[PDB]
């Protein structure tokens, strides 16, 4: 489905707003401070995830691997480069529903690969 996103006008750089073309039945975006119009490519407008199953692998930063206060195991090798050190931690996120799942971040410089088991 997609979580969609904003679009900005190209003249006054304001927020475009979705509106309906009544003649051609084509979704348009129009700034309200000028006459600028643009055709909607995505065709979805407002999308809301209530169940909100969230992918934490997107939020996790690779720099986390430098923290002394996080644990690490040589049990789980890196999936990409096959490095033994992995520094694992939990959600660290409020409103996570119920997750004790560990997320893994590969140590060694610049790898930064982030997986979940």
């Amino acid at each position: 489905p997609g979580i969609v996103g904003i679009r900005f006008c190209q003249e006054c750089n304001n927020m475009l707003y979705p509106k309906e073309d009544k003649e051609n039945r084509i979704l348009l975006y129009a700034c309200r401070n000028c006459d600028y119009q643009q055709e909607a490519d995505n065709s979805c407008i407002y999308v809301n995830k209530i169940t909100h199953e969230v992918d934490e692998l997107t939020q996790i930063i690779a720099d986390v691997s430098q923290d002394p206060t996080l644990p690490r195991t040589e049990d789980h090798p890196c999936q990409k480069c096959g490095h033994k050190e992995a520094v694992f931690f939990q959600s660290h996120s409020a409103r996570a529903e119920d997750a004790m799942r560990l997320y893994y971040v590969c140590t060694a410089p610049h790898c930064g690969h982030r997986w979940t088991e």
Binding site: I61, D63, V64, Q66, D67, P68, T69, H92
Partner: protein, 98 residues
Amino acid sequence: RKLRRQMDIIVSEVSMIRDIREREIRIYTDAGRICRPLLIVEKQKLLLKKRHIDQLKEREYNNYSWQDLVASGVVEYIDTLEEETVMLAMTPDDLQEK
């Protein structure tokens, strides 16, 4: 951290905090913060050696004291909100391989 342990540009009182997950870095020179000294650990060894303790043992008439201990980078003042980024060992015992 290296300039604070030599006390060149930065008084030992300034505290500095690298928060990784939110990407901030904070440097507080402000007055009122509360900080207590700690030994420093580089790799698995304390930076307090025996030669430091022999000089303090004789501290009388050496003109060699705490400030000369802090100025060698062996001890460090660490306030609270910088204790969130630190790993402390209770005693040198925890440093040895268990």
